[PDB]
Amino acid sequence: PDSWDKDVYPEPPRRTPAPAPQTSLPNPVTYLTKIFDLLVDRPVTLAREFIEQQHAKNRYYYYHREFRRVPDITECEEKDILCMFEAEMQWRRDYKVDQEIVNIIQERLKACQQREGESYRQNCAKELEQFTQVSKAFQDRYSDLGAHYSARKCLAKQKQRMLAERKAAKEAAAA
């Protein structure tokens, strides 16, 4: 379906076997789905065509909102409230986008687990690794801010982590 892009939500080529009736008995499944088609699928399809023509008679569009980039909290003065407000709003928008990214990855993981069936442990290692990476990044960004989280607290946590990383790297280099 064109409603969503295949690249963000990838799917395998979905190969399926062909029917190989080894006996002459008529299986009830084929006849059952034929009568199901005749009794359900055709009226639903016809109603959909009627509704789609009615929608085509009146066509209108909506646009995805675009947002400009604004200086973040790192380029804001200590007591300047306007730039702090702009940076806080931008940080909240980025936080929401990151949450949606993690949601997309989790959707991929769930779909892979359901699709691959009994061999989910092996055939979905790539999705598990992707989710591990994205979850590690998300946790590093926003694990312990808690309620009343803010851009300043996130920046302080990042500064603490980078100070620790710099100290560890300096110790390892001079070890």
């Binding site: 993690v102 591990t132 979850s135 590690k136 998300f138 946790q139 694990s143 808690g146």
Partner: protein, 64 residues
């Protein structure tokens, strides 16, 4: 009416500070609080120490 009044409204005017009552009130009103405080404090110090040493394996722990 006598039953309800004696159950609800006649308790305090007949109350007397007694070693039995003082000890029982202190126990049942203070002991559980300090017990649960000690339990939760010990658990949280253990968890904080494990986090500081980094040996807790908090992978996939995103919602809190």
């Amino acid at each position: 009416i006598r039953w309800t009044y004696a159950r609800s409204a006649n308790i305090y005017p007949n109350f007397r500070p007694t070693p039995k009552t003082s000890l029982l009130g202190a126990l049942f009103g203070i002991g559980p609080l300090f017990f649960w405080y000690y339990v939760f404090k010990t658990d949280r110090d253990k968890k904080e120490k494990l986090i500081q040493e980094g040996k807790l394996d908090q992978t996939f722990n995103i919602s809190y």
